[PDB]
Swiss-Prot record, chain B:
Positions contributing to Zn(2+) binding: 27, 32
Taxonomic lineage: Eukaryota, Metazoa, Chordata, Craniata, Vertebrata
Interval of the full protein contained in this chain: 68 to 480 of 1203
Protein's UniProt name: Nitric oxide synthase 3
Parts of the chain that traverse the membrane: none
Subunit structure: Homodimer. Interacts with NOSIP and NOSTRIN. Interacts with HSP90AB1. Forms a complex with ASL, ASS1 and SLC7A1; the complex regulates cell-autonomous L-arginine synthesis and citrulline recycling while channeling extracellular L-arginine to nitric oxide synthesis pathway.
Coiled coil feature spans: none
Cell compartments where the protein resides: Cell membrane; Membrane, Caveola; Cytoplasm, Cytoskeleton; Golgi apparatus
Tissue specificity: Platelets, placenta, liver and kidney.
UniProt similarity note: Belongs to the NOS family.
Length: 403, 400
């Protein structure tokens, strides 16, 4: 078992959980591909995945080997033999969604993994009904700024019928209008989905923070366009506690991060539409979304307004401007009473999570490059913690864009 | 051939050089261990592989001189059990081992390296002389120059040359009855060893350690570095006048002395090399790490920051100003230093050069991305492939 060291404390653990990893990652003894973003391109193997998951469920409730456990295994075996597939019990769906979050190697927020509201939308039958489920999710999760983690699970993939899909990468996203110069107005991350919305009849704006409509796909149907009710989309105007001109930049961000394009896998069943939401870590907005060169790219503009010397790297003007942008995000969200966590508190809670999981399961899959925040890396405890990355199921997985 | 993407630009390359990865790393299809710090006819086969590398690099592949060199090493190892590198082979081997080092962000410089051949060495006193000339050459009154001194290779039946110090210049670290450390906690072990082997200690936070040099099969011997050989930089801040009163300092020359150099199956356990510092090594890791000098909260108190909530980003503001102090102080003292923005930009150019030269470049993302301002540097957005090529710099157990 791999020996794992914390270099701040000198302490040593062994990740025995990794030995149970099912699916394979991209690394070999010859070359490590741990830094790649996308590390990746029935009845018998369905059952082995289903049996393993049922075994996980009955362990979680301290009832392994019980009569109920044996009967549920036999019951899943019979449904798979008769129909080629099976259905989760309500309780198994709730457990499986929490487990998938718990298993997600790139999530620093997993201290919260047991506090997840699971909306069962498996009886959904139309794109219009999808939209109602989505609006109820956003209302519940937003909670007028007191954010609450939630996941809505639409029907599973099954033979003879198309998938439910949410085409948008997140429930709330800003338009990115590809200008003719090859530039972008708005968020360059969303140029594709923006052009698809327009092509599907959306009348576009011309702003930098235009909320996109939803493109929702019901089985064997072209996507359908739905506009979010403005009262449902909580947004935070950005201002700085001591730089009064900062508010004149006209920056904003939205309250609720709600990823809608990943696939949820539980016991071999696949849910291609299962959007989930929590709350933001402030570096996601302040450092990546606003300062990445290929996103809003505001770093130079802020530094010039701060009267920093932008003609030499050695002044550290980039570092200084980024710090103040991160202060603005945190100040602005706290002022608006919208839940947010800074990267110091988030990584401290992740260290606690590693300690809990070492005790509970003997390890924790963790992707160091994603867990370490994009600023102030070695000023947080996770930088000094060795991590082991592997794939457990249930899981959230990437999946191709449906177009 | 792994497909490698830059997410800032969208450009794609393929790493065809990872196919030649000679040794085996720690990762498997089951689990990635990329974040871990420490992951006869045998000698002849590595020796042959290196010779072909060498003659390929000078466009002499397979020809007259290539065959002659292959037969010499064969007869050498038959007679003695090892073999001697030609001086040019040794220079080529040192440079390649740097070029191949996945965790080094400074490899744009790999072709410019002064190699000091100390293979004719015996006794620690001569070791000390080679090291002192290395230090004087590399320091060069603050205009730093990259250098490596190569001491005799390990061979059977004979002991080893070792430099017990992890670096040629290190500050001592002393413990007390409250368990804490005055000085550098990283050097508590070597400091008590220097104390055992003669050295009488100081009681400062920046006492330069003596050298514990080990000649084959003798005990290590205790040598003091002449103070004018050790260039140091007192740290001040361009605008925070109280920063100087903190009394912080660092030394000019980063000279790693505890890694093993491996060339063509030969192993040199004492081969100290030096370059110059990247500012974050000093201002973020050595001064701000919690298990190092750990001065971050001291600076924040001096800056009148709000230290009772993390969301004020007092740690981040204090770290930037410490890195500003480091850069300003080295530049004012006319000592070579590179900030992490310039350094990562140059590594990007290195990646492009190596793509054309060898079809790839082994790189360890966790070590190439700086410990502050990660995503503000271009390397953060660059996917990288990590693998082991030879010649190489390798970790090795401590002598004790
Ligand atoms: C409750 C507060 C939460 C916080 C602060 C948080 C934080 C984060 C952050 C910062 C990332 C990196 C994302 C990026 O850089 O683009 C991430 C990734 C991720 N999170 Fe969490 N998260 C939270 C809740 C959740 C919940 C409720 C779920 C699902 C039920 C979840 C599942 C995931 C997954 C699957 C990833 C990986 C995304 C990928 O691979 O691209 N997280 N999280
Ligand atoms: C000339 C300017 C140079 C710069 C700016 C530079 C920078 C760096 C940095 C920042 C690291 C990370 C080390 C750490 O975090 O402790 C590193 C590692 C390394 N460097 Fe360079 N370096 C330079 C020259 C050299 C030279 C001349 C050699 C050898 C001839 C070399 C070989 C290595 C090796 C082997 C490592 C990995 C060491 C380890 O794993 O601890 N570097 N370098
Ligand atoms: N707190 C949160 N956060 C979070 C969590 C998971 C995933 C994400 C979003 N992950 C985005 C990765 C990314 C980054 C940039 C670009 C991109 C940039 C420029 C152009 C094109 C694309 C694309 C992607 C997705 N591949 C956020 C939460 C959301 C939900 C619960 S918690
Ligand atoms: N510019 C440079 N830099 C650089 C490059 C390579 C290697 C290193 C040193 N790598 C440090 C590894 C390290 C540091 C601290 C501690 C430690 C800290 C606290 C307590 C105990 C130990 C342990 C280790 C290795 N285990 C620096 C150059 C040096 C030479 C040419 S360029
Ligand atoms: C190339 C590299 O893998 C890529 O930029 C990664 C690095 N670490 C990350 N970490 C997080 N949390 N989110 C990201 O999008 C990324 N991007
Ligand atoms: C746990 C982790 O591997 C360890 O802290 C590494 C991470 N990246 C690093 N990168 C550099 N340049 N130097 C280091 O010491 C480390 N430490
Ligand atoms: Ca049924
Ligand atoms: Ca006592
Ligand atoms: Cl986001
Ligand atoms: Cl150092
Ligand atoms: Gd002001
Ligand atoms: Gd004062
Ligand atoms: Zn790996």
């Amino acid at each position: 078992f791999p020996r794992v060291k914390n270099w701040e404390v000198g302490s040593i653990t062994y990740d025995t959980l990794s030995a149970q990893a099912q699916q394979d990652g991209p690394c070999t003894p010859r070359r490590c591909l741990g830094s790649l973003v996308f590390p990746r391109k029935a009845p018998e193997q369905l059952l082995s995945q289903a049996r393993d998951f049922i075994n996980q469920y009955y362990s979680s409730i301290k009832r392994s080997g019980s009569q109920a456990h044996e009967q549920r295994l036999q019951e899943v075996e019979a449904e798979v033999a008769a129909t080629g597939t099976y259905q989760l019990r309500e309780s198994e769906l709730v457990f499986g969604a929490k487990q998938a979050w718990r298993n997600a190697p790139r999530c620093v927020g997993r201290i919260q993994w047991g506090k997840l509201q699971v909306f069962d939308a498996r009886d959904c039958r139309s794109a219009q009904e999808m939209f109602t489920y989505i609006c109820n999710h956003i209302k519940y999760a937003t909670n007028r700024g007191n954010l609450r983690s939630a996941i809505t699970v639409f029907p599973q993939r099954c033979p003879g019928r198309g998938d439910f899909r949410i085409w948008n990468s997140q429930l709330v996203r800003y338009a990115g209008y590809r200008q003719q110069d090859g530039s972008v107005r708005g968020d360059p991350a969303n140029v594709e989905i923006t052009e698809l919305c327009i092509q599907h009849g959306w009348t576009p704006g011309n702003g930098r923070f235009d909320v996109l409509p939803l493109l929702l796909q019901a089985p064997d149907e072209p996507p359908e366009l739905f506009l979010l009710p403005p009262e449902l989309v909580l947004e935070v105007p950005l201002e700085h506690p001591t730089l009064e001109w900062f508010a004149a930049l006209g920056l904003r961000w939205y309250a609720l991060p709600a990823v809608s394009n990943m696939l949820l896998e539980i016991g071999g069943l696949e849910f291609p539409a299962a959007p989930f939401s929590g709350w933001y870590m402030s570096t996601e907005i302040g450092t990546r979304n606003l300062c990445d060169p290929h996103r809003y790219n505001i770093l130079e503009d802020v530094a010039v307004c701060m009267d920093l010397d932008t003609r030499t790297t050695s002044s550290l003007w980039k570092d200084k401007a980024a710090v103040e942008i991160n202060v603005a995000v945190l100040h602005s969200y706290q002022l608006a009473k919208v839940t947010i966590v800074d990267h110091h508190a988030a990584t401290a809670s992740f260290m606690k999570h590693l300690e809990n999981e070492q005790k509970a399961r003997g390890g924790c899959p963790a992707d160091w490059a994603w867990i370490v925040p994009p600023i102030s890396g070695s000023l947080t405890p996770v930088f000094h913690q060795e991590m082991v990355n592997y794939f457990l199921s249930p899981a959230f997985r990437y999946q191709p864009d449906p177009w």
